[PDB]
Design a protein around this ligand. Structure first.
Ligand SMILES: CCCCCCCC/C=C/CCCCCCCCCCCCCC(=O)N[C@@H](CO[C@@H]1O[C@H](CO)[C@H](O)[C@H](OS(=O)(=O)O)[C@H]1O)[C@H](O)/C=C/CCCCCCCCCCCCC
Ligand SMILES: *[C@@H]1O[C@H](CO)[C@@H](O)[C@H](O)[C@H]1NC(C)=O
Ligand SMILES: *[C@@H]1O[C@H](CO)[C@@H](O)[C@H](O)[C@H]1NC(C)=O
Ligand SMILES: *[C@@H]1O[C@H](CO)[C@@H](O)[C@H](O)[C@H]1NC(C)=O
Lengths: 273, 228, 99
């Protein structure tokens, strides 16, 4: 039951002429905000996206981000020119925080260049990753001597974000704790080994994410059950499949059992054919 | 009031310590606090700077006790000398959403006279005009600021000259036509006062932000006496 | 430094013929974040395809979800075609009902 706030930024520079900067905000697994290069403001995707913040508070934040995007693009382009860095440039920012039961909180600010970690904001100052291009330190000593940037980032991460997240959790409590019942169906695919079959148990439309899926014969669990990756549905639910390798003819008697918090204490048991 | 110095006057013996109180009001999360010293010559001298995110500032005999919660920043002079007799001003630099531009005004308290117990003067007649000349070597030719100090009141910025737009930017409430500038970023720059009244009497400073360290440098004040 | 995208096609609801459904196309593990994604019915482009705002995981690799309305039949085939800089020729993945 953890709901950290992830604020993501994708900034692409193709050439001196062409640049995009877009952003997202996730609370847990749900996207609460969207930020487009075309838009002058950050769009709220949920009724509770603003949390308990007033309009004045949200306008203050809106101003900062608007100024931030302009300067960031200007700073990077000039900094690249000074170092003779070759376009294209791909920059990513991951920042936010997490609220803990004891009124305590932890935050993070991470920047990546061309897919690799370069620097991050720890405490009151910026610090490089152990493997980073030597020129990263040039950017850092500049960023550290910037009082406005240094203090505003702290104010956002430590001062604002924890209060913001607390507001989101209270205002959006009904939707965050929602229960969505899974739906299962069975399928079979020819195995790599001749004279065999692979059974596929599909589970889709469920939330929250934790789920239990196992192939079973009677009350005995099949150990050969192979769980797959969680694949997102676009309706904000999860999709998952489980596979079992069995010899042809051994299919009968097998069932797929599914345990989930939304099922009211009763497992979904799906028999073959 | 944005900056409050409650003590109007303080007298202290030589070789002892004095503490000057200053209270400020700001809604910003990042700011500077400055302490200035006005000599009897009306020369405005920078003493010490207190950052909002920094620890208590200590320079020479000057020390700052910074309480961020109470928004209380108090200067303390350690061993008072005879040359320490002056009017001390508490000042607050605020930022904008763009950070701390060199267009930033400095907000003054009304000041506190400290008495330790053991420049050009111009006179004009009502209806005439006057030219205040600015002598400043360094640091920043980018924006030249003009401040006015009248006794009983806190020093106010009248305007500043933008050398990037080559224009004058007047503070809110000041009627155009009263003040204007003529010259380049070089010391030839002067401020013209038109249609002088008796309330125009005071000390006029030219000021710029320093390049190396961030502080407001004030030039030698010009004393303007106006008679009816 | 360019990562090859991984494509996965799956349906929102149980795939029974004649009944309306939603087809998801999930692209992951690619970089740079510039990608072309088309969903194909019988080899032809589907006009209306909704897409999520592009995001990335903790490893900084980008991912995006494409989805559209479809009604599965016996004859009709559905595929997801992806053009990316890390690949010479666009990779196409066909929807398999039994997978
Ligand atoms: C609590 C958060 C709640 C959020 C809820 C909604 C979420 C939706 C938003 C999603 C977006 C997610 C991405 C954004 C994440 C948070 C970003 C926080 C940004 C804080 C910005 C701080 C203030 C700011 O705007 N800084 C900007 C403006 O600064 C000012 O710029 C002025 C000129 O324009 C002056 O230089 C000025 O200096 S002075 O001397 O005149 O005073 C100076 O203070 C400044 O650009 C800050 C830059 C920090 C960028 C982050 C570090 C990047 C390092 C990597 C780049 C180097 C490598 C480049 C390689 C080619
Ligand atoms: C920059 O890239 C855009 C597409 O990213 C391209 O259309 C344009 O040609 C590029 N600019 C130049 C000057 O090549
Ligand atoms: C992104 O936004 C900036 C500022 O609004 C603009 O100058 C730039 O052309 C935009 N880029 C694209 C690709 O629309
Ligand atoms: C804010 O951060 C400071 C140190 O950076 C810490 O002492 C304090 O507990 C934090 N406040 C909150 C509300 O997390």
């Amino acid at each position: 039951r953890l709901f950290p706030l992830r604020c993501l930024q994708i900034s692409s520079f193709a050439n001196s002429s062409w640049t995009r900067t877009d952003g997202l905000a996730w609370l847990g697994e749900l996207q609460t905000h969207s930020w487009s290069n075309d838009s002058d403001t950050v769009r709220s995707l949920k009724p509770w996206s603003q949390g308990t913040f007033s309009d004045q508070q949200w306008e203050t934040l809106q101003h900062i981000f608007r100024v931030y995007r302009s300067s960031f693009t200007r700073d990077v382009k000039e900094f690249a020119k000074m170092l003779r860095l070759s376009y294209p440039l791909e920059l990513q920012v991951s920042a936010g925080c997490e609220v803990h039961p004891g009124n305590a909180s932890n935050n993070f600010f991470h920047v990546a260049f061309q897919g690799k970690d370069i620097l991050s904001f720890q405490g009151t100052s910026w610090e490089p990753t152990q493997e980073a291009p030597l020129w990263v330190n040039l950017a850092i000593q500049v960023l550290n001597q910037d009082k406005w940037t240094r203090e505003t980032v702290q104010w956002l991460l430590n001062g604002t974000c924890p209060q913001f997240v607390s507001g989101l959790l209270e205002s959006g409590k009904s939707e965050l704790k929602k229960q969505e019942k899974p739906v299962a169906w069975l399928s079979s695919v020819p195995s790599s080994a001749h004279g065999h079959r692979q059974l596929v148990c599909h589970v889709s439309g469920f939330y929250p994410k934790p789920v239990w899926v196992m192939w079973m014969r009677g009350d005995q669990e099949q150990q050969g059950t192979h769980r797959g990756d969680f694949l997102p549905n676009a309706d904000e639910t999860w999709y998952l499949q489980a596979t079992l390798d069995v010899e042809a003819g051994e299919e009968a008697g097998l069932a797929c059992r599914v345990k989930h918090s939304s099922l009211g204490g009763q497992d979904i048991i799906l028999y073959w054919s | 009031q944005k900056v409050t110095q409650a003590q109007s006057s303080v007298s202290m013996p030589v070789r002892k310590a004095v503490t000057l109180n200053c209270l400020y009001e700001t809604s910003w999360w990042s700011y500077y606090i400055f302490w200035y010293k006005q000599l009897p010559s009306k020369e405005m001298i920078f003493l010490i700077r207190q950052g909002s995110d920094e620890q208590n500032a200590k320079s020479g005999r000057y020390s700052v006790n910074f309480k961020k919660a109470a928004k209380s920043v108090a200067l303390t002079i350690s061993a008072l000398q005879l040359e320490d007799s002056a009017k001390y001003f508490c000042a607050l630099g605020e930022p904008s959403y763009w950070g701390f531009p060199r267009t930033t005004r400095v907000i003054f308290g009304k000041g506190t006279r400290v008495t330790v117990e053991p420049t050009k003067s111009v006179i004009r007649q009502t209806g005439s005009s006057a030219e205040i000349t600015c002598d400043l070597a360094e640091g920043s030719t980018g924006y030249i600021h003009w401040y006015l100090h009248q006794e009983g009141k806190a020093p106010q910025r009248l305007l500043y000259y933008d050398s990037y737009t080559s224009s004058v930017v007047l503070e809110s409430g000041i009627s155009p036509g009263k003040y204007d500038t003529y010259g380049s970023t070089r010391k030839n720059l002067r401020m013209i006062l038109r249609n002088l009244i008796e309330n125009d009497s005071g000390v006029y400073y030219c000021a710029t932000w320093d390049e190396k360290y961030y502080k407001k440098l004030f030039g030698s004040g010009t004393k303007l006496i106006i008679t009816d | 430094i360019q990562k090859t995208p991984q494509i996965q096609v799956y349906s929102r609801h149980p795939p029974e013929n004649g009944k309306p459904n939603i087809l998801n196309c999930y692209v992951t593990q690619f970089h740079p974040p510039h990608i072309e994604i088309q969903m194909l019915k019988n080899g032809k482009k589907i006009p209306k395809v909704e897409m999520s705002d592009m995001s990335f995981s903790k490893d900084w690799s980008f991912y995006i979800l494409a989805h559209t309305e479809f009604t599965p039949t016996e004859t009709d085939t559905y595929a997801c075609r992806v053009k990316h800089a890390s690949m010479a020729e666009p990779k196409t993945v066909y929807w398999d009902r039994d997978m």
